[PDB]
């Protein structure tokens, strides 16, 4: 369902149409007014259209009969499709300015908000869902305006990227019981190499800046780096991963993940969950609301601890979230204590561990009375 | 309580000391001017006495005030959510402005020996990078008024005066290649937070002064506590200053600039906003005169709230001639296309009856001068 | 409840008693050998007033047994020591400790 | 195995080095309890051996410094430093003995500048604390939250400081030698730790006179020669040392500052003396100039009968020669002033060869030096730099930001005044930890202690300089916005702040206007707090308007709409605390409603007489939204007010609706009476929000327009039945104990005066016809009962004193009045 929402939800991706039009060439030629031409979601891969049960709604692609989704922008309310030009042609329609109303060149309907506003919109946020109008009111007139070419590429990558790891989730929980014994994996091969390199080039996308860059151009750098990672995990794949994790270290060994995707995965089982636990690292590496989001479920990453596949991502990991944010410190209990104390004498002198520590004392210059004496209870008395 | 009121004597000494203390420095410290400012940049101008080796590469690092700018530069260009202040910046932003101008048949012989030499005071400091720095605290403080944003404009005035040619260079330069829209977009924001008059605050500060409150310890007579109009008439005034001398010498290629932004994502018209600003001036001067029509005669903090909102007026003004002068053929068409005109019949109606009421008596000799000049 | 064990003989005839106080450079240890504190390091005698029960019970009732200017070896049980509750973040719960207790002079 | 084998054993180097960063961390901001435990793994000497063993490597040696520091020295040092921002100056005669500059034969304009932090400092600053490190000692019988804090671990001093000194000096003449093995590895570790302690103790104050002439030989010799060894300044170090000598110059000009102050303190001593004499002498010569004087004495009279204020002001001023003539100070005295202003200005280094031959002149010149050196690259050292170069040259500026938080105190209460300094120190300590129930009673006993002195009443302007108004009102901030979206943990201190604030804005004028610039943060910061009970701080908003016209009414229109918001959300929904304790569900929430009328009564109704500003607006804004006014008049659907009160006399007398149905609570809620003194309240506002009288004969338009507006409103005759109606008697009964109601469950006189102040400023009484009409139906039962409650037994009983409160304030007045 789409709708007319405000604030920061129409700055992101999920706000991106894609002005297709009907012709094979010169499909960038400059817009003229009434040109028909279809509409796509890129994110989510689907297109505009308008059917039967539900009215005006996305409809997936493959259904794209050029009838329900073809569309026209028109001057005005008035009742005005002209050939296709060998070039762009006049430049008539400008980046925020030209004002367009745009009507179903098949239903003959205009673009309007629906009118009445619910008890929802009596109080709370307020987003008016959009109605295929058949005549329209005054202040339906829509602008359009540039987007940023970067997150415009981030946005044709996050649809892939939600098609690789959503196809892979189906075909990990395909095999969650069922062992293979000695003869056939469960179903259809898994994309172990399509998601490896995968892997690679989002941890290559979400690398932070160097430090010897000069200071003027790395803040910039960062201001790309917090971008991109926003919408990411406004995207929805930061729980995505976390499902990938979880679906993958209920198997103890890799020997034991053959019984179940088969003994061709068993070899690529250590690479791809320790490559999501550096994934994961990077898209909550400097993130205020990403690693916000991580005290709901800070137990998750403490019980993992004493996993034994991957002990120097999941410590970086946890790390990431402690020295950003300060209340996750005030959620940290006892038990989650103890268990670090105990990565100490489960994997010898690691001074990573000790950096955790120093991270649970104090949270941005506030100290944390209630973890710094659990710190001293559990550790200094027993010098050992 | 006054004939029966305590004298001086009858105080206890750490009373009477306390007091003593604050009126000491209102009286003798504040009134007193010390002039270091030139010393200090003078000092830092110089890079001298470690050219003892004279390398060839000659990389001319930075001299003392040279990283100052730098200092304050990065400190603007990172990244916060909201800029705090700085006590520093403060202090020697302010030593940077006053230490720039320095400043009846005068022959022009010797008259362009001060602005060649203020040139050259004004060179001392953009040739390290000042101006970018200015534009950046400009584009960093977000659209958030403060002493910190006045400072800086203050200092953007004091490396601006006379029109200086290459500082508007520089500036225009910066602003194309950096193509960053925060800069327009932090203008506009403090432009639409300059206060306008206010009838209803104007008539609370007379009931305020008709009941005349005083302290304890002590009395002060008719306190002069901030007024709640025109607290920002200063920086409304400068404000407006530096956008005039921005534009100051014909500089049409920065006045196509702030009609449109080609290179910029998205274009702010400050012309057309500057307009909506002088037209809420209009109601509101439209209106101050309006509570005085029905009366006869214009009391003392009135005429003040006319002379201070007029001197306003003018700076738009003046601002609005430099933004059009050259003539400048984009914005002569944006003035037709604004609400301009509704602003000019306002003035006009509003100048008749200043006139015809203000000539009644020689007391108004002064607010009918500097009426008379305004239009 | 606690043992005692001189290490160097003082004097052997005096005995603290109630109105003097009592000045120790003490050592105590945990039970594994584990030293944790001492009054050498501090360079200062340790003086502590009997009868109040300021310190623990059994450094109170060795000090009372053991005479003057000697040199002893004490040891407290956790049942005459902080026990359960230990010395926090300083002693493990219910942990034996011992004393090189040098009770070098009365007042 | 010996720690300096770690020089080659990195593995275990590093791993150490971050362990004593975590024996750092753990004792981080004044955890004193665990700086304690930390002394049996780290011992004095261990410390002291480690700062002098000269072959350890740079991290552990830094480490342990640091270390030695955060046991010992950072929580005294962090106090000790928030407190050199204010200069609280006794008048004593060794206060007296300050001056400009030391006795001397140079020049009669200035002498030579006296060596900085040498000398005698009389500001007030608290002493230490220190407990020993004892672990032999009893567990106390005490538990957490009550025990009185721990105070940081002792360690010698004086020892400390003769070692610092010592190894300074080692370190200093190294530098010189031009060795290849620097102690620790590089110039920076051999400097940097030592520097810190130095640092420290500097700022601790531990060193001494001839400690701080050594430090100066050392720092530059020859510039400090009161009357190879090259200093500091010429060893050409690396940046991040030069930092630390950047922090011990910033303390010298500290130092010098406060010398400065000091000096203004025991100028203002004698100065205030000898020009009281003169103008004793002057009043005197007054008294006796009547017989050769006329009328035009009220000139020479004027200073008597004007308030010292501007006395003072009048007799300092004739600093520009250009006004001697109204100034009758003798010449002799204006000699002493503007002499003491030369030499002040030439301290300053105003106005009155490679030698500086003064800290200010020597600081200038080497941060120009440095930075015309390198292009230094370390942005905190450039700004730590221009900081020191700042204050060199503007002299008179920085003792200008210093005057303000200048003070003087009589001898008499140092010891009281030393003691809330004590108390303050807890109370700044505690923002920069997460709030606890440990933390909690220590501010509350700070703040009882801040009550009990009685300094706090006798110099508020001190109290005000200070900034406690301040400080109080962020630890709440971090109470509101720690966990506003579940529940506002540990209400205890909040209500001991809100209750310190409310009795803070009764002091003075001057104390209410610094919480008058604090409302619209509060008011938005009181949207979560209604949950809480007890002293909320809308309280202390309503504490920050009263009895204040001029400066307290000037709220802005914004303010109130969004305060009148909040009425209608709380007379939109119930409470949740109500809903959560069992309460029967009612669609409005009339405890948080009359809360916000007690506030908009007192936001309009000043002095006794209705503010024309405030009243217009505020009923503007509640006749646009009809749910304020509660169900009741609501239009259609809104019931009369006659039918409101009846319905909440009745949910209010019958239980299992009027409560939880399971003041035992000590705050327990009656629905029934909380509906019925809403509408009280309401009504009450109403009444203060009238037109007053004199503006209703002059004929103003809005004026009669809103006086008609409340009458439509309001009908009379609900009120009249309002007043008719009866109250609960006690009576004499079961056993002759006395049979009396419950008072915030039944009906109180209360209400109606609440009746009777609306009847006397909206509708009137004009005719004898309706007046007599009200006094027969319904005042003169009550003030029958009054009478006949007037006995032996129940005269002092609480309704009996209602009554008669009820009737002197409102009632009686009307009828004395209405008596033609």
Redesign the interface.
Known sequence: LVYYEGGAVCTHARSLWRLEPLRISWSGSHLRWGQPLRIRHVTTGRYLALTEDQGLVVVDACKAHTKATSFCFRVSKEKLPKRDVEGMGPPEIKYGESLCFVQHVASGLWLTYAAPDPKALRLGVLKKKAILHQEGHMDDALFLTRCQQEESQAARMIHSTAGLYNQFIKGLDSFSGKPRGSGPPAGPALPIEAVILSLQDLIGYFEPPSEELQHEEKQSKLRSLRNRQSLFQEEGMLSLVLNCIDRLNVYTTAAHFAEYAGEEAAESWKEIVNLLYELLASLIRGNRANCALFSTNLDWVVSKLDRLEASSGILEVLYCVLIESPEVLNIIQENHIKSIISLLDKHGRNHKVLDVLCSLCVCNGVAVRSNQDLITENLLPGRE | A??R?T???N????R?????????????????D?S?EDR?ID??S?????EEEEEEVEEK????LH??VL?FS??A???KSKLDEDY?YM??AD?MAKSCHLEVEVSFEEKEMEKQRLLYQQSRLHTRGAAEMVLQMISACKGETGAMVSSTLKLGISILNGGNAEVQQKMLDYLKDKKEVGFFQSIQALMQTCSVLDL?AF??QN??EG?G?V???????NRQNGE?VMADDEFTQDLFRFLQLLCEGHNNDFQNYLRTQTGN???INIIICTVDYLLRLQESISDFYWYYSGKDVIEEQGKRNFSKAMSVAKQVFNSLTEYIQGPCTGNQQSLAHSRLWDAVVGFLHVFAHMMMKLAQDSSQIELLKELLDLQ | GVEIETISPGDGRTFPKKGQTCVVHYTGMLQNGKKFDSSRDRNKPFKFRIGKQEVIKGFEEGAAQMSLGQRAKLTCTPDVAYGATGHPGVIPPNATLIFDVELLNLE | MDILELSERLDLQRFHSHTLRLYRAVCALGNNRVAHALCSHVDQAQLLHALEDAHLPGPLRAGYYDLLISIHLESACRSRRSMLSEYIVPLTPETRAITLFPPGRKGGNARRHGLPGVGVTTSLRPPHHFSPPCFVAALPAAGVAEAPARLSPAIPLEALRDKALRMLGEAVRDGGQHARDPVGGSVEFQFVPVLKLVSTLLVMGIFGDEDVKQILKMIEPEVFTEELEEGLLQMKLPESVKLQMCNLLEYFCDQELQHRVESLAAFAERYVDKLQANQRSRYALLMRAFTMSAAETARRTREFRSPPQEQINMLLHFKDEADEEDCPLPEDIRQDLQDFHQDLLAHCGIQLEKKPQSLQELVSHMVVRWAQEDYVQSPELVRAMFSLLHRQYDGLGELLRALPRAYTISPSSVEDTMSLLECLGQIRSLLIVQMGPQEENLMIQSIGNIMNNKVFYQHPNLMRALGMHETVMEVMVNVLGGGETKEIRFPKMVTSCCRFLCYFCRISRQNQRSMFDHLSYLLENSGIGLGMQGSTPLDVAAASVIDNNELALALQEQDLEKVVSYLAGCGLQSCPMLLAKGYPDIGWNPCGGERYLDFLRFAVFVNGESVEENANVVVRLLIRKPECFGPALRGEGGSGLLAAIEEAIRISEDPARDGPGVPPEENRVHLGHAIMSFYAALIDLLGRCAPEMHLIQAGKGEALRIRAILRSLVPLDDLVGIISLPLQIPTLGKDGALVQPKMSASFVPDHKASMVLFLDRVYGIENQDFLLHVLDVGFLPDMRAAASLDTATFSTTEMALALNRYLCLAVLPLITKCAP
């Open positions: 006054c004939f009121m004298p001086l004597y105080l206890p000494t750490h009477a000391c306390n007091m003593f203390l604050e009126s000491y420095k209102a009286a003798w410290i504040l009134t007193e010390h270091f200090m000092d830092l110089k890079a001298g006495e470690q690092k930075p001299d003392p990283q100052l200092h990065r400190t260009l990172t990244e520093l202090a020697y030593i209803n008539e609370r009931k305020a009941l409150m302290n304890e310890d002590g009395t002060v007579i709640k994502t998205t274009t």
